[PDB]
């Protein structure tokens, strides 16, 4: 899993 900044944010596993 990792935090991705689109500019809100997403936690993707």
């Amino acid at each position: 899993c990792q935090l991705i900044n689109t500019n809100g944010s997403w936690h993707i596993c």
Partner: antibody, heavy 119, light 112 residues
Framework: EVQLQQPGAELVRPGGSVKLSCKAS????????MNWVKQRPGQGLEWIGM????????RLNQKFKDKATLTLDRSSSTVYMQLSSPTSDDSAVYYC????????????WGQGTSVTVSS | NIVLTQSPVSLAVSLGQRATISCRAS??????????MHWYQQKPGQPPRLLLY???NLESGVPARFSGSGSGTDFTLNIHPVEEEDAATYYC?????????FGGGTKLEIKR
């Protein structure tokens, strides 16, 4: 049902001002992101920016740095875009659109406001 | 800014035939198991209609005849059996970074 209410058109004297409105209904206003998109009839889409209603965070397309100001009114469930120093180049349809999840895909769209900049 | 280049500029496809539309980004729009590429359909006098999000997810109500694929910098819009109501302009759009960009559009004309 989710609905984004936009006026049909705005007539604006060049140099005058104009502040476009987008009234959201059908969901908790303080969720998702409201985006603004420009389109000359016949031509493509161009993204101006977005506002997050939960905390008023904004992101703006630096090409509109000095043209677009995004604000909101929580009690009105309304999001606003003001355009500075309107010229004939600002004449276009402006859509507001709400993301379907988070800050991402644009599920819900206003009908668009056609701004005409003319004496 | 990421520039999104679509091709072709326009295409004609007969009432049963195939339409395949392409979108290439300036740099990747992928992170983790997500591709932040999205597709829209527009007909004159109306706002765009989201068809596909996250590369390959059909929005609710959108016919199974529409399908998307791609990874990284290359994306594909495919339309199963082309029906008459598919005459439209199709746009790709990325959610990867601030300054969302759209592709230039692809007008689908039906042959008849």
């Amino acid at each position: 049902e989710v609905q984004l209410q936009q006026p049909g058109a705005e007539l604006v004297r060049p140099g005058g001002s104009v502040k476009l409105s987008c009234k959201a209904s059908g969901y908790s206003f303080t969720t998702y992101w409201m985006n603004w998109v420009k389109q000359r009839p016949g031509q493509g889409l161009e993204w101006i920016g977005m506002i997050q209603p939960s905390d008023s965070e904004t992101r703006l397309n630096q090409k509109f740095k000095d043209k677009a100001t995004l604000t909101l009114d929580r009690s009105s469930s309304t999001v606003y875009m003001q355009l500075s120093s309107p010229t004939s180049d600002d004449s276009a349809v402006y859509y507001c659109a709400r993301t379907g999840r988070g800050d991402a895909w644009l599920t819900y769209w206003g009908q668009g406001t056609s701004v005409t900049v003319s004496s | 800014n990421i520039v999104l280049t679509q091709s072709p500029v326009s295409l004609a496809v007969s009432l049963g035939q195939r339409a395949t539309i392409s979108c290439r980004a300036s740099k990747s729009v992928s992170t983790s198991g997500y591709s932040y590429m999205h597709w829209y359909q527009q007909k004159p006098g109306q706002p765009p209609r989201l068809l596909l999000y996250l590369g390959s997810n059909l929005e609710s109500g959108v016919p199974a005849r529409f399908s998307g694929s791609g990874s990284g910098t290359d994306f594909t819009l495919n339309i199963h059996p082309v029906e008459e109501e598919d005459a439209a302009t199709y746009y790709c759009q990325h959610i990867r970074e601030l300054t969302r960009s759209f592709g230039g559009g692809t007008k689908l004309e039906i042959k008849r």
